[PDB]
Every structure is written in structure tokens, then in C-alpha cells.
Amino acid sequence: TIYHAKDAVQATKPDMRKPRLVVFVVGETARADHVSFNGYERDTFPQLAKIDGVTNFSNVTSCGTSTAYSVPCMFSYLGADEYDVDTAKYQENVLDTLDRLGVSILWRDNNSDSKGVMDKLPKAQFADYKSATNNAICNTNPYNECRDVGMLVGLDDFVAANNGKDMLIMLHQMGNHGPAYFKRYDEKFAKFTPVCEGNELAKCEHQSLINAYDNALLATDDFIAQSIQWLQTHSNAYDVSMLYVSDHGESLGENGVYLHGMPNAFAPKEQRSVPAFFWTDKQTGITPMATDTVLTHDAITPTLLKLFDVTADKVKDRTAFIR
């Protein structure tokens, strides 16, 4: 492997200060401009609106327009300008660094896989939550589709197994994956109706397409809120924080363009404008950056290091989501 933060050190250890517990939700296909906090005309995040300590970031751009391109870049040391997708898996990434320094890494996936990010770490630290073998919440809908909230089940046991250590938990969402947006949420989030069903998105009435997309966002609002609520059950023993960033956006009929995956040189802005949220308990001493900070996926790696009191010279002066 080729290293980029061999110099990295953790300034303080959980035996002298409170251990730190962080949930990083890797979102899927969510657009910044369909978030209520960013000006959208519908209340797509009603549950997050009721939680104090949530920062919504209004100017975040993804590294690319697809899961395969963006997810390795989100955890990279290279930054979007120097990032290479084909050789990313051979580079030391930020999870490699945190694991080397003693942070317990867990990756639960209801999307696909880590796109190479977890490859160097033991297989037991990656868990497939797309099937009923691990996910207890797949029988809540007629498609028998496993839900993101299922990734929260049993995390109390993971904390008990790593009692006293620093912990970083990645939850890779099914989220707003298309084209069958109507399958991405249970009946309790079917607020906006009617919805488009079927696959020929250009043939669907446009408003019904948007309705299905917005209902999926409601289910993600719920998932992030329940992630924070879980972390709050551990706030006494742990300094708890939550980071959410979507891997890319989505086209929804603009210029007749749908879905994502366009090359960056010709991708419409809708495919790279993503939401990001950060929450932390009042005890942690962590302070968010201003909500209007110009941010990209390049901010994720220095954010994760900073959350765990880690200094790496490569990202020393890189903009983060927190101060």
C-alpha cells in the first residue's frame, strides 16, 4: 500500500479523556435543493428540524456523480483534484489511518459495498445489511426491501463490545436510489401523492416523479433523526457526533436528463450538489464551521481526523466541516 499519513498521531487517547463515538451516514442520490433547510418549498426534513445542534451545510459539491467514483474519493487523502478512481484502492485512506491509531471501524452497507474503502481492514468490520440475514427490517413493505433503519439494530451491542474505545460507524444508505424511488420508503412516509411507479421516468408525469423522490427524502430524515437519537443514548459515556453527506445528486428531468453518472465535464449541476448535516452533543466541545462554508467531499477526511483528535500533515490546512 502507498501511504499518505504515516505521520498521523492521535493527540489524546480514550484512557485519559472521554471516548468518542461517531456515526457517518454515507447518503445516496440526495440533492441539496430538495432539502427544506436549503430553500425547498416542501418540508422534506421535519424530524431533523426539531433537533437542536444540527448544522445544515448549504454549499457542498460531490467529488463525482456516481457511487463508484465518489465513495472512494470521500475517504481519500488526495482530494478531488488529484484523486484517481482506478488506483484509489491501493492508497492508504482515512479509515486505514484511524484503524491504525486504535479507532474501532465498522461499516454497515444497505447500498452495495464500500467501493474498495474497507478492503485493507478485516472482513469482520464490514457487514452486508441488504439482506434479511443481517437486517431485521425487510418485511415492512411489499417489495421485501431492507430498510436503512435496520442498520441501527444492535449497535448498542457493538458499543458494548468496544467499551471505552473510540468508535467510527459508517452506515451506507439505500437512500434515494432510483429509478424506483417509490420502493425506497415505507407507507408511513407516503406524504406526497400520487407517485410515479415503473421505470420509464420520462414517461411518468413529472410531479408524481418528484413526489416519490420527496417521500424517499422523508424516510432519510427519519433515518438520520433515529441515528442521532441512538447516539444520544450514549452521550453520558461518549462524546457523540453524527456526519451525513450524500455521495452525489440526481437529475430529475432537467434538459430531459434523468438519474446520475454523467462525466464531471458534462454533468449538470444537479448531479453534484449534495446535502450535508453535522450534529454533536453539547458536551463534545466540537464546533461546526459556518453553514455557508464552501465545502466539497474533500472536507470529509480532515473532519473525521479532527473528530478523533488526529493530526495528519497532508490535510493539515484542508477545510473541514468543523473548526
* Residue ranges at the known binding site for Zn(2+): 28, 67, 247-248
Question: Which x/- pattern over 98-117 shows residues binding a copy of itself (rule: CB under 8 A)?
Answer: ----------x---------
Nearest distance from C-beta of residue 51 to Ag ion, angstroms: 19
With binding defined as CB under 5 A, does residue 318 bind Ag ion?
no
With binding defined as CB under 5 A, does residue 323 bind Ag ion?
yes
Q: Which residues are annotated as a binding site?
A: 28, 67, 247-248
With binding defined as CB under 5 A, does residue 177 bind Ag ion?
yes
**Using H for helix, E for strand and C for coil, what is the string for the chain?**
CECCCCCCEECCCCCCCCCEEEEEEEECCCCHHHCHHHCCCCCCCCCHHHCCCEEEECCEECCCCCHHHHHHHHCCCCCCCCCCCCCHHHECCHHHHHHHCCCEEEEEECCCCCCCCCCCCCHHHEEECCCCCCCCCCCCCCCCCCCHHHHHCCHHHHHHHCCCCCEEEEEECCCCCCCCHHHCCCHHHCCCCCCCCCCCHHHCCHHHHHHHHHHHHHHHHHHHHHHHHHHHCCCCCCEEEEEEEECCCCEECHHHCEECCCCCCCCCHHHCECCEEEEECHHHCCCECCCCCCEEHHHHHHHHHHHCCEECHHHCCCCCCEC
Taking CB under 8 A as the criterion, the residue among 110, 134, 176, 284 binding a copy of itself is 134
Binding site partner of 247, from a copy of itself, Ag ion, none, Cβ cut-off 5-8 A by kind: Ag ion
With binding defined as CB under 5 A, does residue 220 bind Ag ion?
no
Give the residue with the Cβ less far from a copy of itself, 82 or 317. 317
Question: Which x/- pattern over 157-196 shows residues binding a copy of itself (rule: CB under 8 A)?
Answer: xx-xx-----------------------------------
Name the residues that contact Ag ion, by CB under 5 A: 4, 16, 28, 67, 109, 111-114, 172, 174, 177, 206-207, 234, 237, 247, 252, 289, 320, 323
Name the residues that contact a copy of itself, by CB under 8 A: 32-33, 38-39, 55-56, 58-59, 108, 123-124, 127, 133-134, 136, 153-154, 157-158, 160-161, 273, 290-294, 319
